[PDB]
Structure 1
Amino acid sequence: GSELETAMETLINVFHAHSGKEGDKYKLSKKELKELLQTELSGFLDAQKDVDAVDKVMKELDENGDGEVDFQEYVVLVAALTVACNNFFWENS
């Protein structure tokens, strides 16, 4: 009944919606996540303030898109947007 557990349910909702493109549904290729993220969210991409983080992650995904990841890696990929937006106060702002 916690709010924090409902969190992963929402990622599952979009994750498993497009899962199976890799061959397994408990998995997804990195490229697919980049596509579904922009199709659903289209907001946090403008909320990224750590340009160095996102630059290195966007290019990472561009080289590694044909590889494979899972829900756990997917949740880290969305959390990369959180640190770029909120953790950004790690420096004078």
Structure 2
Amino acid sequence: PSQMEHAMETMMFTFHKFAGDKGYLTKEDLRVLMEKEFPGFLENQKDPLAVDKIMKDLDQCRDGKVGFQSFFSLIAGLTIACNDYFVVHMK
């Protein structure tokens, strides 16, 4: 498998891991996910409303459910922010 394929699999298996048989994640799931997979970020975000605000944007329909694609939209936004930051300050 290539590195790209291992990476895509890790992101697929991640979401499933926190989503359960129910196939989606609640806000209770986003937080944990975010805690165990991005440790230096919510805690370093100073605010206590961290997760709620993430989810605001993830949940159009306010049904309290985050599915795969919206999950991907989270990762996309974090990855593109890091890339922006990398190209300017580090590349």
Work out which structure has the larger RCO, using CA pairs closer than 8 Å and 6 or more positions apart in sequence.
1
- Partner residue of 1:61? 55
TM-score by length of 2: 0.57
Aligned length: 82
Identical positions, percent: 38
For structure 1, list consecutive stretches of 5 or more residues without a partner in the other structure.
Answer: 47-56
Structure with bigger strand share is: 1
Off by >3 Å, runs of 4+ in structure 1: 62-66
Instruction: Say whether residues 1:16 and 2:12 are aligned partners.
Output: no
TM-score by length of 1: 0.56
Structure with bigger helix share is: 2
Give the whole-Å Cα distance in 2 for the aligned partners of 1:15 and 1:58. Answer: 18
CA RMSD in angstroms, aligned pairs only? 3.8
For structure 2, list consecutive stretches of 5 or more residues without a partner in the other structure.
Answer: 43-50
